């Protein structure tokens, strides 16, 4: 797996792979 710099859509491109489309919340802050 690659250690990489990622903002928004790129960060979700790791998130979506790491969570394997099972599910996640990419929101930067809760409130």
């Amino acid at each position: 797996f690659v250690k990489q710099h990622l903002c928004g859509s790129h960060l979700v491109e790791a998130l979506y792979l790491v969570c394997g489309e099972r599910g996640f919340f990419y929101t930067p802050k809760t409130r």
Binding site: F1, H5, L6, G8, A14, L15, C19, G23, F25
Partner: peptide
């Protein structure tokens, strides 16, 4: 937020698997 770490520095499953809800 994790974005503040991942967009400025470097991330992998070791950081991102904290976002998953499932």
């Amino acid at each position: 937020g994790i974005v503040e770490q991942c967009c400025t520095s470097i991330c992998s499953l070791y950081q991102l698997e904290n976002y998953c809800n499932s």
